[PDB]
Amino acid sequence: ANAIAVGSERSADGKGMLLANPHFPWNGAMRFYQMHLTIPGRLDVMGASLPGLPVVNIGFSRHLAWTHTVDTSSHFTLYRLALDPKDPRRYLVDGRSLPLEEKSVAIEVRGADGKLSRVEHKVYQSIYGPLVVWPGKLDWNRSEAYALRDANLENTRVLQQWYSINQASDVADLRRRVEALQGIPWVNTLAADEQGNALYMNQSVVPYLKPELIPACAIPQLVAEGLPALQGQDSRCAWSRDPAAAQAGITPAAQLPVLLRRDFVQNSDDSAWLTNPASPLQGFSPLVSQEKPIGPRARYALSRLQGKQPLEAKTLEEMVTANHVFSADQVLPDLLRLCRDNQGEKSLARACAALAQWDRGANLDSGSGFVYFQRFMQRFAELDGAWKEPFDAQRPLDTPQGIALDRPQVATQVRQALADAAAEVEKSGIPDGARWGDLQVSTRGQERIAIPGGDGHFGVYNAIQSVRKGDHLEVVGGTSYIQLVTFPEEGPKARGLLAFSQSSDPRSPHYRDQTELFSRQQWQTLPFSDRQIDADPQLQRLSIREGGLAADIRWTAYGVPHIRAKDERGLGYGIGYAYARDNACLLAEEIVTARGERARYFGSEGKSSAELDNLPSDIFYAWLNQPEALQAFWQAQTPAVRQLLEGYAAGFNRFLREADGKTTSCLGQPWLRAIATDDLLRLTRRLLVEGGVGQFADALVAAAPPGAE
């Protein structure tokens, strides 16, 4: 993700300004969806959110605009256990042997001959949490095993937190509602408001260890691999329980980085350190924020944001639509000198020509040099001492830079990496003179739409991640919801797109209408006031009831629903109905995943949208969403949240009762069925653990002791 909040001192109009550009999948449980929610007098906020959630995750209201980026804090800890030398099913805490908890789950699998079979798996849990095995790496042998405590497994405030965010009026109000509830799982928060404040917050759920305990409790080699690993045989290494924290064992708000400014704040998924170099954030816990080099996306943003010139909204827009490969600025000059110097080797002929013609961009009409440059960087990045100016912690904006072509070995190393990378390119039969837009596409039914942008690792702000599928590169994630908000006196003027369009269903009119506009990088008005909404020639209005539940739904262009209701139940009613019309098949599938029933419907020869095999994914979510977990989670929800969720499941089921396949391709499938509120709790918890134990779902299923059946 990228995010830039400009305050009154740097904005051309003297008011707040926010650029929101998260990078998320183009399919599955994390596919963003535009919506505008309104409960008159209490709630009116527009933006985008994740499937199944009756709140807005990134958006804006009349005086405020906020967004999220991934942070560098830890949201879980790996605990290395010391096993009882006489029983690998027992572990030691301060030298005392304790039994491992044993919990059985059962899964149903549909065989090839349609028959059903039951699979039972045992999950072992320590006082820290479930045991995980990364075979070969985090083994369960006779002296040690590994457990994983996910801090968000105990976060029941997650939906209450965003619903509170949706009611925030400005930056001060926003800062209060997040600090008080501490419900954000694993993202930063940046925001601007009409009065010209710019806010950055590393306010999330972070395990708490007092600073003096960290050098002793941390495992150095594993922390060196970026893993938050603690000693699990020492009671002094349990998470510290500060009574000022909203959840037992997490870091209280006052210790997490916050920066309020009137010039600007930015973040492109690095630590809080360089949110604004004029005001560095240092001296925090290493579980919270370290002073490490920033990625090229942040360097690009900071280079363009330097100085004191007033910024226009189109300047923020063009920082994305430019598709500038910022990493070439540090490598391409030296690389082209090498290229001309070696105008003899006929091998390097094609690559050097493409690199010389390359416009240093990732646009649709950018030359094939971008492909050559990409493969070169992958092999240049695995070479120590190749940077002429290596990283200097005192110049982290200008460093590293340049190729040290002066030394004899690196010169022939860089020439070797270029020669290797060039061979890989022509080994794929890519035509001569092919442009980037001819290669990177997004499949829409039977056709392909060219998608500009490139992978963020190369400093492309408009980060686009794709994989090779057949004769092209299929876009899999990246720039999703785009939001650029300013605050003229008339009202919030917002402008953006949903790159993959509102509906994942090919039958829908909103399956590729915004993807075509993204291909041409034509951002559109996001209508918020009733004047813009009601003056749309494409407006469609409809009221629905049952019971009770009622909602007033307006649809503007590209299928963006605007839901008006009297209470949370009716608000959820409209949300569930509108989202089902666009994405009923997506949610039906993801609910089957979060229920642990993929092998029941699709058999064991399949994968989930998370590229997890059907059987291990089922075992994990059966453990994660067992009924005791759902009951305990539900009983911890505020009444408003429970009414939102109840309304959603009703609005979803209301559409299924009327569905005739017009915008629903999975009509007739046995897994397309009415949903309950607990199904929505499963999707929520599935998203919660995505910053922690969810990333270890296969490792949890793999954990078995020596012996055992």
- For residue 559, state whether it binds ligand 83M (rule: CB under 6 A): no
Provide the token pair at 668.
């007739």
Is-contact 334 405, C-beta < 8 A? yes
Peptide bond before residue 400 is cis, with ω within 30 degrees of 0: yes
- For residue 456, state whether it binds ligand 83M (rule: CB under 6 A): yes
- Report the residue number, 29 or 422, with the smaller CB distance to ligand 83M: 29
What gap in Å lies between CA 347 and CA 546, rounded to an integer? 71
- For residue 29, state whether it binds ligand 83M (rule: CB under 6 A): no
- For residue 166, state whether it binds ligand 83M (rule: CB under 6 A): no
Is-contact 81 232, C-beta < 8 A? yes
Neighbours of 469 (CB within 10 A): 12
- Report the residue number, 297 or 415, with the smaller CB distance to ligand 83M: 297
Chain-centroid distance, C-alpha 324 = 22
Residue spans of beta strands (DSSP E) within 509-560: 524-525, 540-546, 549-555
Q: Which of 35, 50, 414, 473 binds ligand 83M (CB under 6 A)?
A: 50
Burial-class residue 453 by CB neighbours within 10 Å (0-12, 13-18, 19+).
buried
Q: Is 55 helix (H, G, I), strand (E, B) or coil?
A: coil
Is-contact 239 75, C-beta < 8 A? no
Closest distance between ligand 83M and the C-beta of residue 480, in Å? Answer: 8
- For residue 297, state whether it binds ligand 83M (rule: CB under 6 A): yes
- For residue 22, state whether it binds ligand 83M (rule: CB under 6 A): yes
- Report the residue number, 140 or 162, with the smaller CB distance to ligand 83M: 162
Is-contact 248 50, C-beta < 8 A? no
- For residue 158, state whether it binds ligand 83M (rule: CB under 6 A): yes
- For residue 286, state whether it binds ligand 83M (rule: CB under 6 A): no
**What is the side-by-side order of every strand in the sheet holding 524-525?**
264-267, 2-6, 17-21, 481-486, 493-498, 524-525
Closest distance between ligand 83M and the C-beta of residue 458, in Å? Answer: 8
Q: Which of 12, 70, 222, 246 binds ligand 83M (CB under 6 A)?
A: 70
- Report the residue number, 185 or 576, with the smaller CB distance to ligand 83M: 185
Q: Which of 187, 422, 484, 499 binds ligand 83M (CB under 6 A)?
A: 187
What gap in Å lies between CA 329 and CA 389, rounded to an integer? 13
Closest distance between ligand 83M and the C-beta of residue 166, in Å? Answer: 12
Closest distance between ligand 83M and the C-beta of residue 626, in Å? Answer: 19
- Report the residue number, 268 or 285, with the smaller CB distance to ligand 83M: 268
Q: Which of 69, 160, 486, 583 binds ligand 83M (CB under 6 A)?
A: 69
For 235, half-sphere exposure in the C-beta direction (CA atoms, 13 angstrom radius) is: 7
Q: Which of 8, 10, 24, 630 binds ligand 83M (CB under 6 A)?
A: 24
Q: Select the span of 63-71, 206-214, 440-448, 583-591 touching ligand 83M (CB under 6 A).
A: 63-71
* Residue, CB closest to ligand 83M: 295
Subset of residues 602 to 641 that bind ligand 83M, contact rule: CB under 6 A: none
Q: Which of 295, 437, 509, 603 binds ligand 83M (CB under 6 A)?
A: 295
Smallest CA-to-CA distance from 519 within 435, 441, 439, 434 is with 441
Is-contact 604 612, C-beta < 8 A? no
Q: Is 17 helix (H, G, I), strand (E, B) or coil?
A: strand
- For residue 268, state whether it binds ligand 83M (rule: CB under 6 A): yes
- For residue 442, state whether it binds ligand 83M (rule: CB under 6 A): no
Dihedral of the CA atoms 261, 262, 267, 270 (nearest 10)? -30
Q: Where are the alpha helices (DSSP H) in 310-386?
A: 313-321, 328-341, 349-357, 369-380
- Report the residue number, 88 or 296, with the smaller CB distance to ligand 83M: 296
Q: Which of 31, 63, 68, 564 binds ligand 83M (CB under 6 A)?
A: 68
# residues near ligand 83M by CB under 6 A: 25
- For residue 360, state whether it binds ligand 83M (rule: CB under 6 A): no
End-to-end alpha carbon distance in the chain: 44
Closest distance between ligand 83M and the C-beta of residue 237, in Å? Answer: 22
- Report the residue number, 59 or 207, with the smaller CB distance to ligand 83M: 59
CA distances from 182 to 66, 161, 163, 645 (A): 16, 7, 13, 21
Q: What is the CA radius of gyration of the chain?
A: 26
What gap in Å lies between CA 466 and CA 391, rounded to an integer? 29
Own/partner pairs, 341-346, CB within 8 angstroms, 24+ separation = 342/415, 345/419
Question: What are the backbone dihedrals phi and psi of residue 285, each rounded to the nearest 5 degrees, phi first?
Answer: -60, 145
Closest distance between ligand 83M and the C-beta of residue 145, in Å? Answer: 24
Q: Which of 193, 269, 334, 590 binds ligand 83M (CB under 6 A)?
A: 269
What is Dmax (Cα atoms) for the chain? 81
Subset of residues 199 to 228 that bind ligand 83M, contact rule: CB under 6 A: 226
Closest distance between ligand 83M and the C-beta of residue 529, in Å? Answer: 25
- For residue 1, state whether it binds ligand 83M (rule: CB under 6 A): yes
What gap in Å lies between CA 373 and CA 376, rounded to an integer? 5
Q: Select the span of 21-29, 101-109, 612-620, 667-675 touching ligand 83M (CB under 6 A).
A: 21-29
Q: Select the span of 18-26, 337-345, 493-501, 622-630 touching ligand 83M (CB under 6 A).
A: 18-26
* Contact string (CB under 6 A) for ligand 83M, positions 664-703, x = contact: --------------------x--xx---------------
Closest distance between ligand 83M and the C-beta of residue 684, in Å? Answer: 5
Closest distance between ligand 83M and the C-beta of residue 462, in Å? Answer: 12
- For residue 361, state whether it binds ligand 83M (rule: CB under 6 A): no
Can you say whether the dihedral through the CA atoms of 289, 6, 454, 525 is positive or negative? positive
Residues near ligand 83M (CB under 6 A): 1, 22-24, 50, 57, 68-70, 158, 185, 187, 226, 268-270, 295-298, 456-457, 684, 687-688
